[PDB]
Every structure is written in structure tokens, then in C-alpha cells.
Amino acid sequence: SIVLEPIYWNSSNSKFLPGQGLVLYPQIGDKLDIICPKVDGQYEYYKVYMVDKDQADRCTIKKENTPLLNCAKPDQDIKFTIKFQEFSPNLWGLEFQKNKDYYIISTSNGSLEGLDNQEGGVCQTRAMKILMKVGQDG
């Protein structure tokens, strides 16, 4: 099992670069956790989704999607584990093949009241987006 260093989904994560977000080149079979950590500032509320290129580019989500992470529990760590491969328990098309690109964003603004926001949010204001260039040579 090859475990890639986890991504902490919060606003202090310097791995989200201006204009680019977080870009990686996972290989098929690699594992990676995305983690919304519990409270020790305040807890940051997010729904984190897989989206297509167009949506990631525009920091915009549509209703026809289901969170990979619903970070709405201050009292406990919430972890999503990706294995970069064809098969998973996800029933809405999460699936990874070599030489393809995949996208994860949140358009939540970090507050409880902005949890379900569909446009902008931290994808825009913090470049909190992940580009996964699967099975590729960077």
C-alpha cells in the first residue's frame, strides 16, 4: 500500500497555490486522505465535491452532486480516503484511469451559513481546489 501525504482541507494549508490550487500526479494504486480536522481559529465548515474541469475553472457546483466530505462536525476528525483506481464504493462515477485529470473543489465559504453555497467560496477566495493528473509524468 503506497500512502501519499494527506491533504488537510483548511484555509491555512499553504499547498493551495495562488491561481493554481493544489496539483498532484498520483499513480494508479496510490492512496490519499483528505481530512477536515477537529478543533484544537474557529472550525471551518465545508462541503467538498468532485467536479468536472469546467466547474473547477469557474468555482461553481450544481445541485446534482454529493459531497465527498461534509465537514460539519467540530468535535471529530472527518477523513475521506481515495485510492486511485477504477473501483470504489462511490455510486456516482468516482473512478480513476491513467492519463486523465480529475478535480475536487469546495464553494463553501467556511462558515456554517455558507456551507451550501454553489458559487465562489474557498475555491475562489483561497484557491482551495485539487487537480489530480492521474498516472501521468509531470
Partner: protein, 412 residues
Amino acid sequence: PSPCRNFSSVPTIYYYRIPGLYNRTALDERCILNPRLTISSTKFAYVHSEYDKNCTRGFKYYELMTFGEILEGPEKEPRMFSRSFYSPTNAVNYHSCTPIVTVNEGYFLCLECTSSDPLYKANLSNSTFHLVILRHNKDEKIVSMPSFNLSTDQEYVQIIPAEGGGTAESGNLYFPCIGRLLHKRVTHPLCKKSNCSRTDDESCLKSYYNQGSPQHQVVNCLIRIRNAPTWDVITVDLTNTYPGSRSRIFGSFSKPMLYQSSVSWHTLLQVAEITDLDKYQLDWLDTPYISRPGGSECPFGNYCPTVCWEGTYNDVYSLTPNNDLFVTVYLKSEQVAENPYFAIFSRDQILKEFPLDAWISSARTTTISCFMFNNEIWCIAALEITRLNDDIIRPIYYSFWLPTDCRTPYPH
């Protein structure tokens, strides 16, 4: 003979990998998915889907159906053998073929629909059911029913076959289905009796909607076909169910049973005695800690109500008339489709379990059927797997020999 329940003097269960039903040149250039298997005594009905290397994002060559026999292999293990395979042309338009086996016929209930996501992107007006009937040394027969013409006990937007398998009883075929209800007929769903939160009941109700069907409740149903003819849809008891999902109606010593994959908060194993098949009423069984990998919201072993739609299908089979001893191949993982384990279990305890071959890179759908063979208890499992880091995607098959003598399990 009675199956052994005590494995103190049974350090090893004997099992054998058995070959797939065909081999071809450049089989490794095909992505073979979604194995569905039902075995009754010496016969089996089997279906899988064959694609190009891109799997469901590429071309579908076959919705491949077969009716075959169980015969002895070189180490006296039961093996599956079939000579004739069948597929529709334009296989991409044929979905969710669901098998039933009898001594003289293999039956498959399929849905024809041009959409790739028929449950959520089509309705009764643009879907057609097809019952495929296979017989030994005879031509295939196909009996069809436009979905609009089906008699239903509730109003549905759409209905699809539920894939895992069905059973023949009372002169009828019973296939599990999944449907989207026109009206909100689930009003008091089964939920956790001792609530974890003040909003459990809300979560239990909301669990019947999903991204594909945000306004229509998704439920289990069955399609009963007589004189395979008359066709009827019977809706599951809506006070005693879980959100509609890939399922199997199977036999345990001539009585009907349900396995329902867990897509909801209720991630624990869902197996029931079907106490009235024509009213689809259930008695859910207690189980040990057997579940399935999920996502972040409903990982393996979640038991408190919440709203999610995730999980794998990993069915079971009863070794006793009393339904107090079962086998399964389950995925021992919180969130990843990997690490299949064979397990023998009572309603209260896992009695023996072990991981299968280390070279399995991933595993998703699994199914298992048991039968008497040479006066011995055997089970065959079909595992939807990959090998070599997704280079080779096609199912594997195992035969498990279950002992009846706890002192001396395996003679010779």
C-alpha cells in the same frame, strides 16, 4: 449432512480458484464487469458485461448471458462449465440483466433503454423489459414488456431490475427491482430504535432521495412473472425497508430470502427472510459485524442515522434451513474497494474468516451461492476484481468446501 459450526479443529478452509467461462486472445484488452451468478443444485445462470479498456466510459461489446452446469474439476472441486453464450446486439442499450436459474431454464430480466443511467434518466414511457430464456441445446427465447404496460401496486416514475438475482417459486419468477415512486409513500421508514440524535427520523426519511432522484423516493420492489404471461410489480413493505439498492432474492431450502446492499447510514449487513413474497414482507435477521466500505459519511460499520448514498454489493448465502449459518465474501475496508475476506458466520458471531489471494489489487461486487455436490457442501463465489494495478479487469471465481465433521473436516 449438517455443516460444521465450530472451527477450533479446522485451521484451514479448503478452496480452489476455478477458471472463467471463456478465454480469448487479448482478454486483458477487455474490461469485464458486474458478475451476476445464481446456482441451484447442478445448474447455474450467469451474466457479466464486457467493455473495451475504458470500462463503462468505453464501448460495451456484450451483455453476456449463459445457462451452464456444475461439473467436477481435476482436484474434485466443482467447476462452472458452459458451451453457449448469448448477448443482445447494441449491448449498451441493455441494462441490469438479473438472473434466475432452474433445472431446465436460465432466465434473465433485462431493461432496454437508450440512456446510460436508466433509473434516473429514463422513465416507464421509454423503457422496455426483456425476459431472456436460455435452454440446453435449444434456441434462446425473448419475452418482452414495455415498462408502461407493467401492472404496479404503487405509482412509479421508473423501475429497473436489481441485478443480484431472483428465484422461481409457486410457478412464478420473482426478480428484485429498484423503483422511483411518483408519490411520497415512505412516511414512517425503519430507523434506529435507540436514536443517536434528535433528527434521526428526518435522516432516515431523507435517505430515500439522492442526487439522481432528489424529489422521488427510491425503493426496493419485485417483478413477479407468471406463465413465462402476466407481469406484476410488488413494492416492499415501506415501513420495514431501507433505501432501494442492488439486491438479490434467493432461496434457503425452498424459502425466499432477501440480501439488500447497504447504500445508506445503515451500513451493516441487510439480510431478511421474506415472510410473504406476494406482499414483499420481511423479517430482518441479526448479524455480526459484517458491513462494506463506504465514503466519509457512511464508512464500514456506521450505525447512526445520517444521509448518504454509497457502498458496495457483497451478498450472502445460508447453509442451514434455520438461517443461522451463512457465508459471504465481504470487503474488510473502511472506504476502499479492496481486501476481500471469505467469512462463515452465525447471526451473532463471525466463526471463521480469512483474506483471499494477495494478488487481488481491488474488489468491488461479490456474490456467492452454495449447493450439494458429491454429497459435500460447496460454495462458488464470483468476485469483480482487478489485478496488476488495474491492468487486468475481469472477475475471478472460487470454490469453497465447507466441512460437515468438525473433528476431521477433510478426508483423504
